[model samples]
Target chain A: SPGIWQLDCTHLEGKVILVAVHVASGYIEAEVIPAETGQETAYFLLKLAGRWPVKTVHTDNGSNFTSTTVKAACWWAGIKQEDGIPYNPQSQGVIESMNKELKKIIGQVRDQAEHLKTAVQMAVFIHNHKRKGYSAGERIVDIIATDIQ
Target chain B: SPGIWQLDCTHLEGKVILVAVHVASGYIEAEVIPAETGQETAYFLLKLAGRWPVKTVHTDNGSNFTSTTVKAACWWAGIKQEDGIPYNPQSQGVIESMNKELKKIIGQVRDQAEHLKTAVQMAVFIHNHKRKGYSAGERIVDIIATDIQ
Candidate 1:
């Protein structure tokens, strides 16, 4: 219903980053850091919602997302924290599907480049508008409207 | 100087049997057994020697071959048992080469309703007699005597 965004964290031996993507809008945010603790999640949420009114922040019940620091940040930001149902994944189905699409897009970019940050940005832009979805026996532009408010 | 015989054992759950093949002469012997006990190995070796003299019996270092019964059988029959080096595989180079030949022949017979035993026999027969090995720019049979005294 609202702009669907996928949130995932990836890490190397010493470095960690949180990736957040809006499934329908194709808006994406990538933050690299030394750790993926609750404090880091809070910092990223605040930075992402800058100058934009966030009605709801939906995410899984991962330890980082459920941490006190993240809850405090959402409370301070006046944003509703929506926790996905445990084990039942129906709430985040849209984001889960988006993750697959993002992976495929990332794979194609990796084939041509050694690094992925710039390619990931390009993928977000292309996935939002350039892609089409089948509906009612016809292809339709994949789009979601966002407001700065 | 001694002829090499590669023996493989297959356990069809109910019974255990050893399949012995003389690499140079292409002679094959299959021994049926109620179980893979040491006594079975002795009985198989007795039958194998009856078919043809086996100077060296080459086999994988499976537990059956190393069992006390098999050792006793070897001592009684005066047949030297040479176990393939554990994991190194250089000791059984001829059998390794034969396995490749066997796979190729089996691939050619994929469409036929052939039993594994029959396929193995055919592969061994073709490898020993039909396949030509180069010996000082002459065919193997032309350079070496066919009959071994």
Candidate 2:
């Protein structure tokens, strides 16, 4: 719900990128997955490579994300999971639209690399370091990464 | 595509189905699966437990229906696979619109049954006997089954 990327997977279909935008800070986390499985979704709940702490996760009413995988991930991580109404993308469109301004992935990855994993990393780098409007200070991770050095 | 279903599953996400409509005799074949894999698509290509033949397979150019899986499925079944241009559901919508009159599966299943497999069978029987304007003569299977007289 937070993103739409037209990925060119090894398979014929697109592998979706799940995105979580830190609503207050505009900090974002994204991952590519085969399908919207709970195990796949758990990636966002955990602290990112020991980087950002996720307080919450919001999602559309996907099937595999029942109380089992994603909820467990959230509970284990102390991250909150909020959901939009079932079968209603209209409401979820807000998240997608807001995140649309965050950054886009598919095209850049397509132009740059044939591999999905490589393109995803490359596109995210371009998004954080290069997407429009955000300055150095507002970029929470960008600033944090600089601070690490 | 073989079928299209608005499957509301465990995570409350809709599992899509591919439907193959017999344009003449009004027989329809539909399949439900965890995801849109090529193996999943093959179920519809083979003749059903009791149904019409799938001579050719048609699809949108997205991932999952890769050349290897679906191509092999078709080659084995001697089913020809046809294609629509990538990123063009607009043009594809025309077929979907025409197929709409063929009958829909989700609603009756939604109303009557709880277990998905049972409901799928229930919805299909109701579809074949009750949906659209097909008469017993047009329904060869229904006739043949009865012709055991």
Candidate 3:
């Protein structure tokens, strides 16, 4: 099971990346979206449901996330949606810090003229492979036994 | 406060490195010891106590660590010592994995004819400066406010 996922949206040079971070395993799944709108985020949500069994998703109380479109998407997928307090660091800090680190990794690997999606995937790959202290030096890849790519 | 520290010993190229990891803050302090004996480990522990406030120390049930010398050293410093089960990954895992990462970092920075102590310090500096997910991406240096050099 993918467990509870911390969901967030981040932007780099006006390009948006929707992130879903597994709370226990620290595995991350991210994709580039055309924009940070409810429609785009919902689309990403449905797409992610096909890849893994998402039980619950927690996000900050951003307007784009709390919209009816996202709520409907979660309902359709049978996944519970939770929203944290606005601008609170402790509530949704996992995805917040994950976004920060992803941006840094993206900055490192993004070559000129390359598509932003490619860089985002590279960043996610690096993030998942890096060992974490919380998991006793086990990388997300090491901890996850799921067959999902 | 520096917080409770996890103590462990690691080796590289037959050289011993004594490590003290602050459990809550994820701050690391390491030094190259001449040997993994009780005397050398005690010396390193005493040296670290002078650098930072020693509160509580947790280590594995290793003979060298459980020796009277190390116990006397902890007693002299008025620090509580706790030992975990031998060969248990769950206990002392923070420092075990930390030693693995420090070795990797040392491998990256060690130059030709460079002293092992220099490389060990570089590794600790890098480890302390890097932000952690446990601390919401805050580096150890940022979390710690001390006059110690």
Candidate 4:
């Protein structure tokens, strides 16, 4: 359950939001990145690995995902990088849905938050807590925390 | 100055938000629709025409924009529907920008809003009133209202 994660990017204003959703518990980790490039993406993947056990990452054919830097980072972290099938556009639906929900929540708090980072973190917290039932009525945060513990 | 407008669609949750931006004054109008059908899109255009002077609408060649129903609706409303060039992706940048800003504002007050309509309408009001500089420090709302009057 903690083994596979889905990663993708969505843009806002002039910045890019790098998002990852743990396939098992639906626990979402997102950060606002300056841009979507190999180096920044690799660092984000590495950051995720630092917090939880990310055995493999699922992504689309975006240049950042396929970049050598990302491959090297995954290798260093002992994580596997897997890309979705070439023609299957809907393959990344889960992460796409997460991106939509994340954007909605980010919009809700962005005006009140001092910075985009703070807004995204706030949205992530709200999404994790409010979302339920990936495992028998348990909240995503609770499920993730219990699994990690 | 009151001649051209841009139109686009963005999805939220399970519904589509049909959006239009007046190029001259930076006025944005948005409404939540059940789906992105040509019939629905045409109706939205007619609705827009009822309130303001829509000489021509610029949009991407999305099916809804090119659909027969939309064409008929434009004809009825005396609106010219213009499609962006096939290869030039940035042709619809103005409406795309408006869509992003619309989604953000919709997210901000969505929770507090009674319904999606209220949220979008509130966002439109806030956007038109707060946005300035299309014409010498005048808010979009003032410019639009003054122009219309």
Number of the top TM-score candidate: 4
Worst 10 residues of 3 chain A by lDDT: A136-145
Task: Sort candidate 4 into its docking category.
Answer: incorrect
Give DockQ per model, in order. Answer: 0.00, 0.01, 0.01, 0.01
What C-alpha lDDT, on a 0 to 100 scale, does residue B44 get in candidate 3?
A: 57
In model 3, what lDDT does residue A32 have?
79
What does candidate 2 score on TM? 0.37
Going through the candidates in order, the fraction of native interface contacts each one reproduces equals: 0.00, 0.00, 0.00, 0.00
lDDT of each: 0.50, 0.43, 0.63, 0.66
TM-score of 4: 0.44
How well does model 3 score by local distance difference test?
A: 0.63
Model 2 ranges off by over 4 Å: A1-13, A47-50, A62-65, A85-94, A98-105, A131-133, A141-149, B1-149
TM-score of chain A of 1: 0.63
Best by lDDT: 4
DockQ of candidate 1 compared with the true complex: 0.00
Q: Following a full C-alpha superposition, what root-mean-square deviation does model 3 have from the true structure?
A: 19.0
lDDT of 1 by residue, B83-122 (tens): 7454655535655555555568645643442344333333
Query: What is candidate 1's CA lDDT for residue A120?
Result: 50
User: Could you tell me the lDDT of residue B3 within candidate 3?
Assistant: 39
The digit string of per-residue lDDT tens for model 2 on B2-106 reads 221111111112555455544344444454556666655544443231122244445544443465765754564456666645355564554455345333554
TM-score per candidate: 0.37, 0.37, 0.43, 0.44
In the range A52-97, model 4's lDDT, one tens digit per residue, is 4578898745685669888876875678888755355665676677
